[PDB]
Amino acid sequence: TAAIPDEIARQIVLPEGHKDNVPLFEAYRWLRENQPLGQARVEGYDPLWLITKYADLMEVERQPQIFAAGGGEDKGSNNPILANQAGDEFTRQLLGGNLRILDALPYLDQPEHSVVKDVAFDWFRPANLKKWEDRIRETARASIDRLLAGGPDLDAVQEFAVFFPLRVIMSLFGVPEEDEPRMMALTQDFFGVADPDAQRDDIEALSPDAAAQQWAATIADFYAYFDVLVESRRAEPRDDLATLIAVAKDENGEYFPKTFAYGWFVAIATAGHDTTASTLAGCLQSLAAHPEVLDRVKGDPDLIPDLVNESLRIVSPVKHFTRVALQDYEMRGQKIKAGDRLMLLFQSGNRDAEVFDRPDDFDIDRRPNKHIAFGYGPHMCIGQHLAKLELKVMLQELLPHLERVEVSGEPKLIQTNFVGGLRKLPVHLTFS
């Protein structure tokens, strides 16, 4: 019944707690072993049930009519992405009483979620992504050509891994190549709201609501860009993902509101490349630590999907979404009350020893690899098949050209409790 101890709670709830993976993962582990379902009561935050166990993540996510993302019929009464209390008060002042700052899938509950998700569900299915594999492979090869040209010493993140997923999604999306640097800068603002090296110049960095001001400012910049793209594609449809979303109409034959397209576009333009870049950089970091794995996958390229799955489980770059209980609910001997918020800790589920043998080991021979890096339930990642295709294609093209990865300098993580991973990985590569 006791609250989670304050230093364990702060490690997971505060963005500064994610600056270093070692103490973060040790806090997840302490909970899984000692207090698998407790309430964090951190100053400045709402109370949060920390969902640390793999089984519990599935139990919550498969019951959306009990555990809502956006607050159910009171739309926007829950923020699916954890802000501090001051930040949710800023957003309620800006929007007028609610937190639904985007019409993107994470903010929506059924049945609205289901109607909106169906606009793009088919596009993202594996069979419908096959048509893009040759373009993806040509982009991977061009990126590898630049890696070989630039020599063996680099930041494997900012000087390699960020570019391939950005070019892939912008080409599929239909954003011109010259607009990639703007999308990259806005993505850093969006995922960097609480990172001290990613502060926008136009917000008060030290305000109690700074992250929420940065979130809102970045969304307004994306809206200005995507208004022009939606109007362009409605006027002249093209064979791109922008068009599919921009022209979408509801059951009454009316366009979905423009902000619904903007919501898809914000998710595509941010998660559509950043998570893949994080997983690729993480995989390279793990191949430096486990050179015998690089040797094995070069010897058997059919192991590449297994390498991708284990990189997803270990990196788990999307750390959480929040839920709110619409009714009282008993789980694991605890009484969640109506109105209580939950924090779904996907990285912790991915280290659950009840599911994974030696869960901190990098082991590509987990078959099946039961990871929950893409979440679960109706909100399960829509982009998962595109991410796994891009990572497979890039590793098929890259690994034959790598004999060894050495980390030659200090890795840096994005300081976030949301969408994180490496921002810097200094390497020395040995090419074949």
Annotated binding site for heme b: 113, 323, 376, 379, 381
The minimum distance between CB 238 and ligand HEM, in angstroms, equals 18
Q: β-pairing, 426-431 with 322-325?
A: unpaired
Q: How far is the CB of 119 from ligand HEM (least distance, A)?
A: 11
Which residues are documented as binding site?
113, 323, 376, 379, 381
Residue 324's beta-bridge partner residues? Answer: 68, 341
The residue with its CB nearest to ligand HEM is 383
Our CB check for ligand HEM shows the closer of 272 and 411 to be: 272
CA-CA distance, 120 to 131, in Å (whole number)? 16
Burial class (CB in 10 A: 0-12, 13-18, 19+), 279: buried
- Residue 211 tokens, joined: 């992250």
Task: Count the Cβ atoms, other than its own, within 10 Å of residue 148.
Answer: 11
Q: In what order do the strands lie in the sheet with 153-155?
A: 153-155, 426-431, 402-407
Pairwise CA distance, residues 224 & 220, whole Å: 6
Query: Shortest Cβ distance from residue 165 to ligand HEM (Å)?
Result: 7
Using CB under 6 A as the criterion, which residues of the chain lie in contact with ligand HEM when the complex forms? 61, 105-106, 117, 169, 267-268, 271-272, 275-276, 279, 312, 317-318, 321, 346, 373-377, 379-383, 386-387
CA distance 76 to 74: 6
Cα distance between residue 283 and residue 339, in whole Å = 39
Q: How far is the CB of 346 from ligand HEM (least distance, A)?
A: 5
> Which 3 state secondary structure label does DSSP give 343?
strand
The angle at the Cα of 399, spanning 393 to 401, to the nearest 5 degrees, equals 120
Q: Decide if 172 contacts 243 (C-beta within 8 A).
A: no
Residue type, 113: H
Least separation in angstroms between CB 382 and ligand HEM = 5
CB of 168 to ligand HEM, least distance (A): 9
